[model samples]
Target: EFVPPPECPVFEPSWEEFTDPLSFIGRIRPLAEKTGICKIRPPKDWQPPFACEVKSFRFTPRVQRLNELEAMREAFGFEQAVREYTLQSFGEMADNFKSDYFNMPVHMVPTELVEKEFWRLVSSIEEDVIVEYGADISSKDFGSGFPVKDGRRKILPEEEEYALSGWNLNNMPVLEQSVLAHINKVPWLYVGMCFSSFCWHIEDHWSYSINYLHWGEPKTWYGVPSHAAEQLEEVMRELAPELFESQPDLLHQLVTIMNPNVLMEHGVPVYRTNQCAGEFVVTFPRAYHSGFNQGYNFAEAVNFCT
Candidate 1:
């Protein structure tokens, strides 16, 4: 059984105390071990500058693939003895492996139906993944609040500094996408419906990350601290030996996913949190983390190296 500890170690510091680039952030700034992969509330009544609507737009995911149909049937639990649908009535169960690029709304999408279909889709497949996360953000025309201007529209010295920042999403398009043209896209938005997830990964360049749940249902997250990183990896390699041995580039490609329950069962100190809208969840440098959405929701994330 898991208990949330009931007490949170949150510290509010003075403005003067925060000038050090060395000083880290959470609970406003949840301390590591004290809060890595843990929950911390946002400032009282604070709201993000953005607004939300209940309906009016749709987005299709960029990638959707799971590795078979029989695996799909088991994953979806359709083979249970009693069964929700009879073998005679349940037509096209094998043909039911639908990797749909969902047309989810920024607003007005029916939460209940989407929730049902999302699970039906994700679990129905034995493979893994969701689309265009990087899709949802673009569909909304939202990006980083900083930099002030998108490079193609208008570029400035101050904005240019940020647009071309080293080791981040801000200048990724600019520095890397030679053919894409005048785009240093940064802010990443996640449109989650029931199980879309971020597989375990460390921020590029070992940078720190901060995420915000802008609106909708909660996102469940699991964190494994830097200190426990090796232990977690060792256990994972032990459990999924073939996954590690067969796929030499697995972790390098950031395609790893593990259940928190299994991790906890192995004695790894895993922590959990449900991030709701109007709240903040910060990721520490080198923290191995992953999460899934509980229901339909919208979230924004950005990478930083402070």
Candidate 2:
């Protein structure tokens, strides 16, 4: 049996507390930083309208070849066809994987089992499976998760307020990206399905990251605090020294999922969370975090420095 790690802190801020995203983050940093990540639930009346319509929205999907970790490469340029088919069949398709594998409804399956089976199947040559998900910058085709000023267009007072807020993924100014125009692009849009995941990694140059779940199912995340960041890396390297060998790029290729139980057993502090629609997750600088999608979902995230 896999022992699940303790959940990270989740904050439900009042209207006043939620007013300034940066300040709220600063206030919680002392506590949340201890766990590496934290969840924020906006005030009861806080609702930012989704910027795109699902039916007409289109996005390019990417394919990942996995063997415990992933080599994210290439696209399924089926753009329009992909978007249409995904919206129509993605839920059923995601469910089928779990139902066929576990013979149970997707939601009924335990998180521990999913984590265990994910690593097991990916590592087993016989159970080799291909996982696909969408990862790209928010483009004109699909639009962005946060409200932005594209034209002199009219927006609700609340929408205008959020767009101007520093916490808005689109609005947050990245110091590094500001200097390098082409390198640092816009916020990322992630369209994920069951079992699709990102390997543990911290943002470039230890910048903070904020992710928002637009809609659909939840995303399960595991994080290691900055203080234990090096310890986690050492544990990972000890398990597979070949990953940290002479080749530097190979280290990037070593993006694989490790069971939290294994990390816990190695004396590393790990935290878990289930981020559902309408909630925001923030990762402090140098926080090593990774997660898999529970089902079909749309998420937007970006890196920013304060």
Candidate 3:
């Protein structure tokens, strides 16, 4: 029958039945209780908030070789590489990264400026695809292109609900019926160019997450089932003993990226998906996931507990 291992499960419900926010979440609850990650496609009519304006917002770009942490990972393994990047999570310790492709506050960044900066940020390695730009920043920082007041006359139900679902970013249209929307308010805005990434890591406190692609290119995902989570950690520990010995939190910082192929190599089960605009990617408790963007795109995500 070719059924997946019990570790990872994928669910796709009829859009007709999964449309009502309250009802959809109810249907999703049981699935999430079992699997740590699921990709949901609302009815095709379910459009996300519209952004990327025509003459509305566009920019130019050039390419530059980047100072990647992978260089360190290859040398000392991710353990030391991350410690060098995050400064042990210490208070404002000076750091070095791809200055051109770092995570930043997007509200202040003009779409034009952002678009132009890519050439300067892309990896110099010819085959290297992973590129990372804006992340873990407030969606509020950037002027929203999605049906924000006066931007568009008619605000669709899907657009508004998707926009407000961002915990830290929207905090409005908050989900009263769903426990997932109640936990945290901090939402991360990911603005990605070709191959940019959100690394492998679980949500804080083992909470669940909901991610939406507002528009533009797709983001590819590879997720590890929660039950195999410890196995994954054990592998990372075996790879970088010193990193785990002194500071285990560094591994959970959400910066280190690993390959699904490697997990499979170790007998860990992995599920994969491609998230397009107007779709929701729900992650379950402690399900480890990592992926890169196919091209320039914008996505909003928030965390909550059930």
Best by lDDT: 2
Please, what's the RMSD in Å of model 3? 11.0
lDDT value, residue 149 of candidate 2: 79
Q: In candidate 3, which residue ranges exceed 4 Å CA deviation?
A: 1-16, 19-23, 29-35, 51-70, 73-132, 143-186, 241-245, 250-255
- Candidate 2 whole-model C-alpha lDDT, 0 to 1: 0.75
Better of 2 and 3 by TM-score: 2
Residue 42 miss distance in model 1 (angstroms)? 3.0
Those runs of model 1 whose alpha carbons end farther than 4 Å from true positions after fitting are 1-30, 33-35, 38-40, 51-58, 62-185, 241-254
Across 1-306, the per-residue lDDT of candidate 3 in tens digits comes to 122223334455575665454456557767564555777766665455554242323221222123243433254323222221121221122111222334553333343343234323332344343333455545454444444444444666656664444321234233335567576554556665554666678876776677878775667777877888899877766654354444656554444555455567787777766677767787877888876664556787877554
Residue 163's lDDT in candidate 3: 47
Q: Highest TM-score among the candidates is held by which one?
A: 2
Report the C-alpha lDDT of model 1 over 180-266, residue by residue, as the tens digit.
547543567676554556767777655666676766667777777777777777776776536354565445335565556567778
TM per prediction: 0.57, 0.82, 0.62
Local distance difference test scores for all models: 0.50, 0.75, 0.54
How many clashing pairs does model 3 include?
9
Steric collisions counted per model: 11, 1, 9
**Which has the higher lDDT value, candidate number 1 or candidate number 3?**
3
